[PDB]
Structures are given as C-alpha cells and as structure tokens.
Symmetry: D2
Subunit: 475 residues, 4 copies
Amino acid sequence: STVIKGGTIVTADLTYKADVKVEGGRIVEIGPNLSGAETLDATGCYVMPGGIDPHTHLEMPFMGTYSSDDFESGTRAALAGGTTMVVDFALPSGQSLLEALTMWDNKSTRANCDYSFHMAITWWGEQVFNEMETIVKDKGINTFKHFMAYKGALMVDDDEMFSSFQRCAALGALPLVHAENGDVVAQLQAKLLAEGNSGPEAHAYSRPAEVEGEAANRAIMIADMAGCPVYIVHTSCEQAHEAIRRARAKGMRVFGEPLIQHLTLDETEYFDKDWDHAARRVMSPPFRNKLHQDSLWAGLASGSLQVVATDHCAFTTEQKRFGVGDFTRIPNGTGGLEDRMPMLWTYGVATGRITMNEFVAVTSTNIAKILNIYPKKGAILVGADADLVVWDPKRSKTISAKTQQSAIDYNVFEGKTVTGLPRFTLTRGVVSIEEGTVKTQEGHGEFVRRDPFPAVSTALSTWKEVTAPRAVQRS
Amino acid sequence: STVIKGGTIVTADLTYKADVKVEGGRIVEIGPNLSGAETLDATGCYVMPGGIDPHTHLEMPFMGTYSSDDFESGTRAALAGGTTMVVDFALPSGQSLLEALTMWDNKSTRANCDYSFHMAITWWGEQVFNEMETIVKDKGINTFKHFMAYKGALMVDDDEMFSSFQRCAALGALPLVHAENGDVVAQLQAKLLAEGNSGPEAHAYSRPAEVEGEAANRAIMIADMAGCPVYIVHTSCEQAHEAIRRARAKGMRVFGEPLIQHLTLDETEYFDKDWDHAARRVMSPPFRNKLHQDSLWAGLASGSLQVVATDHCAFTTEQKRFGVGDFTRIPNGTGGLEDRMPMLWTYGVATGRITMNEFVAVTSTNIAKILNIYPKKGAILVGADADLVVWDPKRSKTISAKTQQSAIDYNVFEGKTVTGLPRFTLTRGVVSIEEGTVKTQEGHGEFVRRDPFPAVSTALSTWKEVTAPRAVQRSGIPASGVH
Amino acid sequence: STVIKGGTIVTADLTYKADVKVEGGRIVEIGPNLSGAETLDATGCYVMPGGIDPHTHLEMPFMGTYSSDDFESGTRAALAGGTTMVVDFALPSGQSLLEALTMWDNKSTRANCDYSFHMAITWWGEQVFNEMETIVKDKGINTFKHFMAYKGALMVDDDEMFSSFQRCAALGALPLVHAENGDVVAQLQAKLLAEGNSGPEAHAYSRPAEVEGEAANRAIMIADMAGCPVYIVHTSCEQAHEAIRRARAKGMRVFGEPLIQHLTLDETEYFDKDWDHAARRVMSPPFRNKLHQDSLWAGLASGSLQVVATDHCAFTTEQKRFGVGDFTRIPNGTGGLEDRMPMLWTYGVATGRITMNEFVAVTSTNIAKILNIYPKKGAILVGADADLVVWDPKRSKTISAKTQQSAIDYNVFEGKTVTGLPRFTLTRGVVSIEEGTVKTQEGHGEFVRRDPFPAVSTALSTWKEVTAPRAVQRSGIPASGVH
Amino acid sequence: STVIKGGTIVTADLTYKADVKVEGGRIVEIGPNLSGAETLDATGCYVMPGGIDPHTHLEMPFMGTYSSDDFESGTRAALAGGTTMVVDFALPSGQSLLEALTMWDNKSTRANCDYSFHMAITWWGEQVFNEMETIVKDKGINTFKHFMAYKGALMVDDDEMFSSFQRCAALGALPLVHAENGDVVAQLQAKLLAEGNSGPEAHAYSRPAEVEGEAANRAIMIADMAGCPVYIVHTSCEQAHEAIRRARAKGMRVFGEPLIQHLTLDETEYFDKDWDHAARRVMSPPFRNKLHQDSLWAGLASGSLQVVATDHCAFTTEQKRFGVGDFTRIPNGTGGLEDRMPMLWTYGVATGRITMNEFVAVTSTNIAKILNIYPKKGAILVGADADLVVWDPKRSKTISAKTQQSAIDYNVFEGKTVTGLPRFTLTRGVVSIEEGTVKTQEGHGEFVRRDPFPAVSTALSTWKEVTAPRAVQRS
Ligand SMILES: [Zn+2]
Ligand SMILES: [Zn+2]
Ligand SMILES: [Zn+2]
Ligand SMILES: [Zn+2]
Ligand SMILES: [Zn+2]
Ligand SMILES: [Zn+2]
Ligand SMILES: [Zn+2]
Ligand SMILES: [Zn+2]
C-alpha cells in the first residue's frame, strides 16, 4: 500500500493530524502511525481531497473553431494544480443529445484523471424532451446546461427554458445556466461595431454587469416555478450575486459558481495598450470592475456561492487574433485549470478570507455533493476514491506561461506569485505529480456516472406539494 | 369669473389658505378676499388640483369583448371622485400606430373631462419604428406601452422591447410596461386547466407575485441599457417594488404606479364561495396577499412609488361569466375611477399614512410632471387649467354599486366607508359635480397634447454620454486570418 | 459492545445505510453486518448524532424566583426528545466569574447527559478582564454571554461590550449576545404600565421586533471592530435575521440561533382571553407575528441561521402569576427541550423545508463546530462519543403537558402533533430512553471541556492583520503648540 | 424695483423662462417682459432660490479652541457661493439652552445674510426637558441636535436620546443626529495612539464607516419608537445610507444630509506625504473610500437623501498643527460654504447626475420644507423673500485658497475646476455679489424664526395613534 505520512488532513468537515493509507485506488485506512511499503512525505503539508473543477471546455467546438487544450492537456494541467476531476460540457448542434454524448466519449480517450459531462440543451423540442430521460437514467448524467446568451447559436428562450426546467424537475436533474440577457448583448454588440468601437475592450462594453444580474434573476424565477434547484455558472458580479442571495433568503435552492479569474483578475486588463494582452483575456462573462471581487469572496465565506471553477477554454494568441477589427470574432475563453487551487489558496486561505475547510468545500466537496457523487469524490473518508492532493503551504512560484502545462502560449495569471502548491497529486491512488515532476498516465481517467434526485431536489419537490394552491370548493 | 372662496389650498408643493379665481378655463388669480360674478363655497374644504388617472381602458377591445365603461361613463365616474383627467391606452392590431390613434380619437368624442393617450407597441418592425417618430413629434403622445404578458395577444419579447426602448430614448419618450413573465404565465395557465383547477382563484395561482418581480427587474435592465427612464404600471407586490427600489438606489430613473385596488383590497376576494364574487375581481396582476399592501403604501410615503392609478377596465358580471369553467376566459380587469381619490384620502390621509401634499403628488402632480404636462395639469398656479376639486373632508358615504357612476353592475369597493368627498369638481372651470349632483357635459373634454424630453430624460442622456465607454487607442494591431 | 442494527445513518455530511458499533462510550466501528453482545433494532429508523441544545437556563435565579426545570429534569426532558447535550449559562452576581462557575458545577451534579457552560459577563472591570483568561485557558469554557437588555439586572453597555469582545478576540473565545435595546425596552415598559396597559400582551408591546433588529446590528458592528465572530442567540424576527444576512454578505463571521418556539409559535398566544394562557408564553424576545417564521426557516435552509435551540427557562403557571397586574413581573421564559427535535422534524423535515442532513446540521453538528467540540460531539464517526438518537419516522404523539418530562404544569406546544420520535436515545452509549420508557441515570452526565481558537477565529484574526490600516511615513512633521 | 431679466427660472417644482421683480426684499412679480428701474442681466443664466446650508459651525468653541470663520466671514463665503442662508448649531456646555441661545444671538451681529440656529442637546435632565418647550414655543427654534460620539464632551446615550426624542415628538420638533458610535470610537482612538499609529490618517482609521452605519440605524430605531421623524446629519457612507433607505422602505420618516466633501473628495487625501495636506482634511465623519460617493449621489437622484450641506467648520493650518503627534488633537472640520453650490452644479448638474430641479431641491427647497420655513425661504414664488442666485452656467474658475472668501489659508477643494458660478447673489433683494465683486453688508442678516409641527410630524403622530397596540379585554 501507499501511505501519505506525517500530514494534517483537511476536509470540508474537519481538520486533524493523521496518515492516509491508499490501496486499489481507494482510501483504506486513516489514523496515526500508519506504515506502508511506499511512503509519501506529507510532513509540514495539508492532505485534502483532489480539486473538482466542474466547468471545462476541452477540445470544444466554439465560435467557428476548437479550443487549444484537449482532454489530455486539460487533465494534465488540472493535476499539476491539485485538481483530480473535471466536468466538461457536451455540446450538441438540432443534433441529438445522444450523438453529442458519443462524440464527447470519443474526445475523452486520453484523460489523465477522471471526468464527467454536463449535457447542453442548445435547442428545444420533443426529441430533446425524450432524450433527457435517457441521459439521466441510462447515461449517468444528471445536469443540463442552458444558455441565455449566444443568440442564433446556443441560446434558448423563457418558454423553452421553463419546459426544460420542468423536465429536469421530473427527472431529478439539475439545470445549469449561463446567465446573460442574449437579446440585449446581441444588440449592444451590433451597436458598438456600427460605432467603430470594435477593439477587445468593447467585448466588456457589450455585456455590462446588469445584463448578467438580470438573466440570473430570471433563471432563478423559472426554476422556482418549475420546482427544481438551479446552478448559476460563472457568477462574476455583485448583480448576479445579489439575485442569488435574495433567492436564497427566500429559501430558494440556488447555487452559484465564481470563477478564479473573477475572484482575482479585473477589467483593467482590457485597457492595456498591447492588443494581444487585452484580447487574450476576452471571455464571457468578461473580467469585471475590481470592486465586484469583494462580493464574490464574501459569498464563498458565507455560503451564498459554493463552488470555485475556471470555465477552462484555452485559445492560442493566433486564435485570439481571429478577432482583430471585430471583438465578436475573438474566441471567448481563458484557461485556469492549473492555477485555480494555487490562486485560491494564496489569495483566499493564506489571507484568512476563507478557512482551510471552506477551501476544500469550494474546491471539491460542495460540487461533489451538488452533482450527487459524494463521498466517492470530494472526500477523505475510508472507501472514497484516493483522489488526493498533498499541499505544501511553503512551495512557491511565480505563475508563468514558460512553465505551465497548458498547450497555449500565454497565461492570464502571468506574474502572480503563489505560495502553496501540490507536493503530490494522486488520481485514484496513481501519483501523477511530484513537485515539478509531471508523470501523468494518458487514458487513466474514467467517466464518473452520476445518479439523479439528491436530497435537496427530493425535499424541494415535497415542499412544493405541501404548498400547492388548491381549488375553492363551490356549489 | 368664478371664485372658489374660503378654502385651504393644498398642492404637492404647499398648503395655505387662499381663494382661487377662475376665468376662461384657467386659474387667473390666487389670494385672499377675491370676488367674482359666481362664487363656490369652499369653507371647511381643501382645494386641490383635479386628480389625473393615467391608467384607463375605456371601451377597450379585450378578451373576446369590450370593457363596459366608455369615454363618457369613465370620465363621468372620474369627475364624481375628484379626477379631472384620464390617460387611456390606444391599442393597435400588425395595424398602424396611426390607424389606432384615429380609432381612439373617434372613441373619445363624448369625454366629460380632458384626456390623453399612451400608444401601445404590440408588435415590432420598420413601420412601427418610423411611426413612433410621427406619434411623438406630430401627434402629442410621449409614452409607449409594452406588454410582457398576454402571450399570443399583446405580448412583445426582449428583443422587440430593447429596440423600442432605444427608439424611446432617441425620441425623448417614456416606455410604460405591464411587467409579468408572459411565457411562464401561459404555461402555468395551461397546467392549471389540465389539472382541473379552472376557477377564478386559479387566475391568481397562474401568475404569482414572483413572475411580476422578475419582469419588472427585466424591463428596468432593458431601459438602463437603452438610456431612457421606464414606468412600471400597476406595481402590485413587494417583489416588483423591491426591483424598483434596488434600481433607484443605483440612481436609475424608474417610476412605479400602485393601483388603489392593490393598496386596499386583497386575494381573499378570490376565495369567496360565490363564483361571481370571486370572478368580478379577476384582473392582471391579480389582487395579492394583503401582506404586500404595506410595502406599496411605504413606497408612496418615501417616493419609490409616485403615482396612484386604477387600470379602469370594467366588465359586467355577465361578461365575467364568459369564463365559467375556464378562468383564462374571464375578461381581466376591475374599475376604480370614481373611488381612487376617496379611498386614498380615507385610508391614506385620514390615517396619517401620507400627508395632504403627498396625496396631491400621487393623485395628480407627479404623473403631470412624468408626462411633461405640468403646470398646465396637476397644479394650482396662475395660468394652470382650472381642473380642480373642492374636497369636503366631512362629506361621507358607503361605496356601493347602487349609487356609482360606472356603467357596470358591481363595485370592487362595495361596502367601504369613505369620509372626504368632492363638494365641487371643475374641469377647465366647468362645475361638473356639485355635492352628488352630476352635471357633466358630453364632449367638453379635449385631447391634451404632450411634448417629449422632460428634464429627467435629458439629464439621463447626458449622464450616459459622460460615462460612455471609450475605445483604447493602440498601434501595430496584429495580423489576423485563419492559419 | 452494543450494535445499532439495520438503520440508515444520517449526519450533516451524508446519508447511508450502516450499523454502528459502540464500546466504552464511543463509536468504534461503522459498517454493514456488524455484531455485538447487545443489539438495538434500528430497522426503518434514522440513526443521527444526539441533539445539542446550547441554550438552557436550568435552575436559574431570575426575576425574583428560579426556573423550575433543573439539571436533572432538563437533561431528562432533553434525552426524551433526542437531545444528548445541553449548554447552560453560568450567571454571576460584581461576583467573580470563578465563584459563578463553582456554583454552576454544584448545580449540575445530577445531570442525565453531558453538559457544558457559557460564562455571562454581567458587569465589567479589571477582575472580569483577568478572570476571562482563567475561564478560557483553565476552565474549558470558550464562550461569553452578554445581555443588551434586562436593564438594572444583567445588562452591559457598548463600552463594556466592546472591551469584552476585544478580550474574547485575544483569548480565541466567542461572544454570545441577547440582542434587544435595553434602554428603549425599560422606557416602553414604564410607559405601558403608566397607561394601564399591564397585561401579558403588553410584554410583547414593550419590545417590538425593531428593538431586536437594532441591537443585533449593533453587536455585529462591535464584534467586527473587535475582530471576533459573534453569535446572536434567539434570533426571532426578520429585522434580526436581515442584520445577520447583511453582515454575512459583507463576509462577517456572524452566527444566528432561531428558537423552535419562534419557528412554530406566534404572538396570537398573547391575545388569548385566558390570562394564564397568555402569561405562560411570556419570554424575551416574545413570540412574534407569524409572518416572521418564514424568514427564520429560510435562514436554516440557506445557512444564514445555523443553530436551532430552545432557551429552556421553565416556570409554573403559579410562578407566571407573580406578574398578575404587572407584566414586568411575569418571569420571562418558556420550555422546549423535549420538543425541539420532534417539532423540527415534523414541521421541517417531513414538509421538505430542510433535508435530513440539514436537520442534523442545525440540531447538533453546527453548534458542535461553533463551540469547537466536533467531532467529539455532533458526529457519527469512529472515535466520536456515542451520543446518538435512533429516530423512528413513524412513531407519533400529540404533545401534551399530561405526558411531558418537564417539571412544569403546561407545555407551549400543547396539542401539536408530531410524527417522528426517538426509539432509543443514547448518551455516551448508555440507553436512557427506549420508546417512551424513561431510564435516565442521574449524575451520568459530565462537563464537556472546550478549547479556544476554532478555525473561523484564527482565519478572521489573519484577515484583520492583512487588512490592518498602516501609518504613512512622513518627514519634516511641522511645529505644533498653541500660538 | 429691481428686475432680474431674460433668465430661466429653476425651482424644485418647475423650470420656465420669466423675469423676476423684487421690491421691499420680496418677490413681487414673475412673468415675461417685466420692467424695473434697476435691471440685473440674467440672459443665458438660471435664476434659482438662494442656497440654504443648514450645517455650519461659525465661531464655534470646539476641541479646546474656536473655528476661524465667524458669522461675518462664513455668511460672506456663503453668498459668494450662491448660498443666502445658514443654520448654525447653538452649543451649550450643564449650561442652560437659553444661555447658549443668548451667546449665539451675540455671535451673529455681523451676519451678511439671514441665519437660524439648531439647539444642541449636549446633556440630559429636568432643566433640558423644561427648556426645550421654551426654545420651541418662544424662541423660534424647532430642531435639536444630538451627538452619539464625542464621548466625555457632547455625547448622549440611548436612554437620554429616547427621552429627548419623545420630548421632540410632543413639541413638534425634529431631532438631528451626529451618528457615530462614540464608545467604539473612543476605544479605537486610544488603541491606535497606544500602538503609535498617531498621524492624521489614523483619525480615519479610528472611526471606520461601519461605526457611522450602526449609529444611524440605532438613531432611526429610537425616533421610530418615539414617533418623531429624524434627520441624519453628514451621511458619508453606504452603510449610513443603507440604514436610511431600509427605514424609508418601511415608511419611516428619516432624512439624510450628504456633505459636498463626501460627494466629491475621498480618504486618499489622508495618505498624502505632506503632513499639513492630510491634517487639513481631518473632520468627522472623515473623508471615505471613493467607492462610497456613488451611493450618496444615487440618494440625491432618488430622494432617499434630501439635503446637501457643508458642516462648515474652518481651522487655520496653525490650528490643525495642534494635533502634531496625536490625531485626536487635530481640530475636526473643513470649510465648504462658498464651494458647495459650485461643486454640486459642475459635478452633479453638468454631468446629468441630477436635474436642475433636483439641484434646487437639495440645495434650498428640501431643507426649507424640513425646517418648516417654506415658502418664505427656498422658493421662487410671489411673496417669498428675494433670496436669489443668478447662476451663469458658463462662468468658470479653478477653486483656490488664493481667491476664496474664507479667512483660513487653504481650501480642501484647491485645484478643482468649476463651470457655473453666481453672476449675482441677492439676500432679501440686496445684491451682495456681482461676479467677482463682493459687496456684502455686515449686519444685514436677520434671525429666521421657525414654527413646530410641519405636516410630516402631524401625519406621523396620527399614524402612530391608528396603530397603537391595545390591551386585551379579559374577565
Ligand atoms: Zn458560459
Ligand atoms: Zn463555460
Ligand atoms: Zn396591465
Ligand atoms: Zn392596464
Ligand atoms: Zn436571552
Ligand atoms: Zn436565554
Ligand atoms: Zn457632526
Ligand atoms: Zn457638524
């Protein structure tokens, strides 16, 4: 067996000094003074569940093109950053959900760590309604992604979204929402181009924070009417956060996911004099005024935002240059898989903004519970997968594209110092990273099947029935 | 001339004892000890600007039939309750805005008091875009109404609304919005019918307060992006009020209009064992849980809601009964023209919930300023129209359909006691009501023309320009193309 | 050993079917198909950590008399309702904190389950400052209670509270607060008595919800300035909840504790025509308008309120009658120990308002973590104390004073039906309740020692240091003096 | 007579082109095409009610010393800035309110424009309770100022404040409150000095925004329980604003007064390397983080803050230097009388943040209505005092201590450009300023008497009676 020895265990539940013994890809024992044939030195370190990043777009077809990190490079980057599972979005074209799922299975051959998919609902009709049942009950996928923006490509309207959320409620599945008002965005994009305001910074101008706050509020109302929880992906601003807080104060089951980029980077990047510098940071929602960061961090501390992710969608500088002269043609996305946990630890844990237990909650455990795969993932418990990071709080670096795992040529965290990095990362007990030594195993990662109807969905359905309005009896 | 003698003047601006002299339809002199050829005794009374109710649907085609108060009976009802101007909604239809305007001119020939129109944008296209300019610049109408619900009948979507609001901004016009999410409401109606939940109470169940709060918050965002103020008609619940408060706290120019029905009546009317009683109150937004009333009153007192109206859209019981077995066929709407000012005075002024100056502000002056027609309307000032109510704070009645001016057979304020009623109501100096004697003059009312660009619109356009995001000047922009 | 067999384990962390093996007062093994010398049948049952109720006043000197549930009857009542630990408030007095502690040790010798204390800071000075260190470091108590009301009896002011909270921050201890404005309450009590408004309902009138919201918001500001978390006991209204939500939205470490009474009972009890019935419910904060309940439930579901408690402070009817003619002399307090978990399960879990995991979190695990005693308490984990309830979701009763464990003559939950009750309650592995058979062991309970500096306190101190405002380095600082 | 000719009248009520005729210190006629023996050219100008600044401390004894602008220099500065009335705080020592009022009458001999007083309640007891009746009914003063801070000097506690607010309710008077928690401030001051953090910037550190937000909320609750409106002086931060907004959303009668300094200046002044620069800006509440300004401006636009003032309390650099080595010894206060309307116009009206009508509302009319002296003051109506400013929207300057009316040697608005300045200022028809020509008349200003029970106070008392809880009738 392998024993991670001499460290302090940190989970979302508690912190305690103990050794961890791993065999057959599982945690088999946790206690003091354990001995195994192989020992990993965790003295001076924190031993935590491997990160789960539920928001990736590896080898994604988007905006005329394909992201430049694929399943192999994305999962390798994830492991180098202490992350041991990714959840990627399966993205249909009036194409079948089932056809899209087959294509995503094909893309994921070469995965270095385990992985699952969300299924995107990119249009609406009888076929989609029928196939959702198959995806949930037969394919081990209990989340459906909806886009309120990307008019003419991926967007659904209120009527379609309501139908889809009702279906998710019936199936015990969870709708995820990209919340921006697509009609307002499409018009503002056209207005800015018409005015000649066509540079990378005009991407930010085309979709101000109010557009995201409105769309989040609207998705929350539709999910409340449908009787399902709802998850707001990449919550970037106070307006979206306020909508979630206000819904949760009414007892609504609404989850929120700030990206590491939105916690630690800001819109002044778009004002840089160097065109490439500004275009490289174009993503949706855009980096925001720095004033919004404090709201997102408070949400992580108080439990109104539960999950930190990256929306990892990486494009080379050459790809970003597709948008010279027209910001709507710059492929949207920045990468972050490898930098998520290191940034969150240095700027969140070392500063006291979040405890170490909260750091585990928002980097693995909460999402594992939300996707109904805890304690297989997101746990340090006997019987859990041995997806583990041994975190050395003193191991430091300056983040640089010169030393990253990502296949692209820049890094939006370039020049940020982090102190606290993986000493080891294990994926089902396979030591894949030892300090700067990368020893990942292509094809090791396996698809993680998920069941519908977590406790939160079952309770909400019961409460809706208790409170359902009744006909008045008359003569 | 005619002198209104011995009263206390109350406006939104101040309260003072003075006589008011009226000549040629206008206030010509205000001061002590005035005399004229005719005298109206205002001793013990408050002399206020005539009410302006900007939310009426007189002889309106709707839900298979027409509302049963027309311009004559609605303006007569208004005058009897101290209201001297109505603003009605011209409704097209893919029919020209100009053809709808002509139709509404034709409808309004027997009006007893003055009147104007809002133009509804019930569909979107190049013709509508163009005709909006003519409506604003040539036809004296500076407001455009948008319905976010009534799917398949009057509803517009986000894309249409955003186009329309940007055109409002360009023209210096003000968008009005019926804020409920029409797509959710249509699906909830169909679901309730399929379950057999088909009675009048299911109307309320089909459109809960959350769907109004969402739509109000959405219309506000779209107006903020277009750079125009926006006006949320019939704000009925705390969720819609919260959206307005949150937007105004950000400095957004958002107006809200609680109906007198939503201040003083509640959803328990729908739970009555009598089908007719419940159906008579069916309107959209529906009467709400009584808990919401305090929020709306607090908005009047604090300035986050500025206008009290009635959405006067009256149907007889037999018209309501079109919806026996199917609440989606009950014509939606209630009447309140004659009862607005009496209810607000008894339940708001006499209770101390609002001052007399606030009462004037939310029953005439604020809407006059919002519609850019102050001080011609909503004022007691020299040069203002002599639209006046002489209000006797001791004159009392129990409201009843047996005595009402409205042409329909019931009154949603049945049995409410009011103390404080018109002694005289004057429309451009014509005494049309004298203590319960109705002496209205058909066709006396005239269309009130309105100009665009009130101060609020001009200031908001300047602030948008000051804060407009600018391009960054760069050199050596890289090569592009697909390699 | 003893094996709890065939049940479903439910903790705040997860839900799973397994047996639980207990040895020497501790959980020694969790897994399938365990066997031991003794078996408890948990088939069809949920096996959860025993409740922890951190808010009791057992044999407490108060308002001219003493509460009538003592350590024995209160811990017996707790065990009967699935609760296996109480935390009581040691109350000095200018009497030493150490003398009060000895007094409370003496009071607790017959406890049936384990117990700990909070220390109340009822006055301020050098001796208190010093003794706080000894309480934290030597006596195993890491919480200090402060009363913002009970003027002339227990109340401290802003200056005392700020000194005390800074000392809490230094010692890694957590301040608890009874948040009502005592100065306003004292003047309103005197005013109501002077007007002849002297009945039990006037207790509620003397301390309306606004006075709780204000005091909660104030204690939060003082804790934020001292750099320690703060815990708001018996959060009863939306105004106190709003203050907590607003503070947590800023990232402040603020905890809130709704009582089961305030989740499920309301001020209409005070309007009962029977004087005894109304007086029995007199407590501070009083039962509130029922509208406030939804806010508190929503706090449990969303995490802005983390702990359900009872503030168990029981008086007989004849003790309540000390206040006939003068509600300020009705001893304040109600009991709920035995009814907390049964009420919360029927009205929260069975209705879907909270999940079973949330139910565990707000009845044991959150407070265990807040008091820094998890996982010894509030856990089902190997090595944890065997404080367990085996809960039969089908076992039902109507709550009644005729069958209760509490020593007093009535029950504020009289007539409430509950479905879901303990089959077994174990305290450190001792089966003390078996289906309505009470078999408690006096003196079995022991004091639970607690350490300072939970993770939340340490992280908050670090954040305060990272953000501490720094002097600006200047040269040639000017001449001063009076010229 | 004198006719202000060719201008556009702007009041809080409306905007219209008309001439204004003045005779006997009053407006006697308003209309087109007026003629008088004397004409003031208002072509291209806006004709508005003279500003009323209800927050001044002229010749004030405070913190061991006396402010360096007295009634003559303060009222001269006010007129140069378009302001035609000041309301100063009469400040007793267990000294009688009536003795304090006599002293303030004596200080105000040399006033160039009209003036009134608020009476400060600086301690509590039977004498104070008795004298409040005399002040209201016999002395023409309907406001009482309370301090929640200045522990050991001016501070009252909750019990005293509640007693005083009940008395104000009975007398139809309005309590004003300096809202900071004095106990927390006094301790933080001592803690910072003990640490050696004793420079001017530590004044700001000693009283963070949360301390003001708490105190404002607490004053609002006490006034609600007492059944009187309440006015929160110098609302400087979002926390205080939020407390007012939340109270007003419940229907409470709460007024708020942002200073021009808090709308347009910020705490980075305290970080300046020059000791004098930083100390000169020390006042209470301190200049705040610039992020708070947007909240205050929104309040002016939406009606949740009603009155703009200056808290004019001017000290020479020599006086500010009293506090070298101990920030608690720096006299608190900055001046602003002359710069209030010019700053508010350039940064508020010219930017579109407020309309011209709102500018009149928050610079004269609202406070005139709040103090129950409208339309004598704050109006352009026939019969109103001819307190008028003819405002030239094109007349511009850079604000400088070299050209100011204030007797001190610096100006916290130094270097700010303003475009829009008085062409004329009239005080009861006396032209006291013509462009840069100052021609003020010492002793012209007269005390303005005010009556109790404005409409808002009467209505609130009625509503409290309607809602008063009743005894239950029992057998
Ligand atoms: Zn997205
Ligand atoms: Zn994405
Ligand atoms: Zn409508
Ligand atoms: Zn309508
Ligand atoms: Zn208490
Ligand atoms: Zn207690
Ligand atoms: Zn002050
Ligand atoms: Zn002051």
